[PDB]
């Protein structure tokens, strides 16, 4: 029915910054728009209704603006308790939420540490072969990991997992798991993961030989 769109999807910011996020509806919803804050692993909490009314108990540093099809939420001075995900919601015709905007802790650039792990002999005995490539303590979160098996790019046979921002230094860690059958795994020799990141002048490549 009513389409909702939030921008940006992710915003890297620092304590004390002025933050403005936008939310757009596919059609006119008048002023019947609410903003909800949600912390990870916790229930969402109401921040603003009628696009500009502050909920009781919400600090005054939050403010809303907008009417018709364009709406904005502004945080005058970001505080550490405000690091959470913000959803807009039209309630003019039924109820639809936006995808949500996650406010990320901005920090300096840190290049990833790259480690590769081959499948254990026990798992190979079990009939499966999982190869793991680990990127530790990097920022920002955007990075590319490409699996190459005897210089052949892989596609559709890997899975990625990303941690939340580390509490101590606000960095990310990412695991990529390449899964193959024992026969497919033993039908090749070289297994590499190549990593590119904005903090790296050249791509980093880790590789091993099957059996080595």
């Amino acid at each position: 029915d009513i389409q909702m769109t939030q921008s940006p999807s992710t915003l890297s910011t620092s304590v004390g910054d002025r933050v403005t996020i936008t939310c757009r509806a596919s059609q006119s919803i008048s002023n019947w728009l609410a903003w909800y804050q949600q912390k990870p692993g916790k229930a969402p909490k109401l921040l603003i209704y009628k696009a500009s009314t502050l909920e009781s108990g919400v600090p005054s540093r939050f403010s809303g603006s907008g009417s018709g099809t364009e709406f904005t939420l502004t945080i005058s001075s970001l505080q550490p308790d405000d690091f959470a995900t913000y959803y807009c919601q039209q309630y003019s015709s039924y109820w639809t939420f936006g995808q949500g905007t996650k406010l990320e802790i901005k920090r300096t650039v840190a290049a990833p540490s790259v480690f590769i792990f081959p499948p254990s002999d026990e798992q190979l005995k079990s009939g499966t072969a999982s190869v793991v490539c680990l990127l530790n303590n990097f920022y920002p979160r955007e990075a590319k990991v490409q699996w190459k098996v005897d210089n052949a790019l892989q596609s559709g046979n890997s899975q990625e997992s990303v941690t939340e921002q580390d509490s101590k230094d606000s960095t990310y860690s990412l695991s990529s798991t390449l899964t193959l059958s024992k026969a497919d795994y033993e039908k090749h020799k070289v297994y590499a993961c190549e990593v590119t990141h904005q903090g790296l002048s050249s791509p980093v490549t880790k590789s091993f030989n099957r059996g080595e």
């Binding site: 019947w32 309630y91 003019s92 015709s93 039924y94």
Partner: protein, 52 residues
């Protein structure tokens, strides 16, 4: 100015449905004098265990 002072009348005839779903506090707090005065055939026909 001199807009139409009547209904459309092709306006919305359905629910909102975002209308008020709560209970209006300023509702009728008195008993409806012309309510059901008969005995309820579907009532408790057993004996209250906590009776005197």
């Amino acid at each position: 100015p001199n807009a139409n002072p009547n209904a459309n009348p092709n306006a919305n005839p359905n629910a909102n449905p975002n209308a008020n779903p709560n209970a209006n506090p300023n509702a009728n707090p008195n008993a409806n004098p012309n309510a059901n005065p008969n005995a309820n055939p579907n009532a408790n026909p057993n004996a209250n265990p906590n009776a005197n």
